[PDB]
Amino acid sequence: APSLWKGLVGIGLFALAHAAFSAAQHRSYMRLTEKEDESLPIDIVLQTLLAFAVTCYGIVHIAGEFKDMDATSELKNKTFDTLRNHPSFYVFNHRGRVLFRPS
Amino acid sequence: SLAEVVCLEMVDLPLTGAQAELEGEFGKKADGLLGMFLKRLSSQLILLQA
Numbered sequence: 139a140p141s142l143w144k145g146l147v148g149i150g151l152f153a154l155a156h157a158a159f160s161a162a163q164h165r166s167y168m169r170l171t172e173k174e175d176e177s178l179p180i181d182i183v184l185q186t187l188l189a190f191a192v193t194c195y196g197i198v199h200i201a202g203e204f205k206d207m208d209a210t211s212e213l214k215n216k217t218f219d220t221l222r223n224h225p226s227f228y229v230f231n232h233r234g235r236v237l238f239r240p241s
Numbered sequence: 242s243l244a245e246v247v248c249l250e251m252v253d254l255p256l257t258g259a260q261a262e263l264e265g266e267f268g269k270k271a272d273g274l275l276g277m278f279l280k281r282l283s284s285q286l287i288l289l290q291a
Contacts, residue, residue: 170260181274182281200286202287 143196150193158185 160182168174206212256264266284267279 156285163263163284164267167263170264179277181242 140200143199147193147196147200150189150196152192154186154189157182157189161186 161178164178164182168176266280269280272280
């Protein structure tokens, strides 16, 4: 799922860049002709707004963690069996050691 | 015959080929959204070829 969102964001960014290039070409043509104070066509403006909204949707979905405020639910499935043993004090005197000695 | 000058003026050049081509390509009288999109695609293809 995240890969699809990343691809959609990339496609939206590419569409935005293409709309930018089209607007730049429009302004370059406008500089050619005297007067004719007209705005850029509305179709490209709608396309760039569509690219603005599409990339704005996946940018929220990419980084969603929203971890729970309560910390009692994170030590909830953990049992006391694993907590009893500690990495610090570790005695290497067990029957399994001499059981596994020969293979 | 270029010593005594009475009146003088300056004029500009007509146009440039690529600039004139762009000006002609942009010229639209009455068209729909599909037509402008097709014209934009054609212009992009021409730019890619260039």
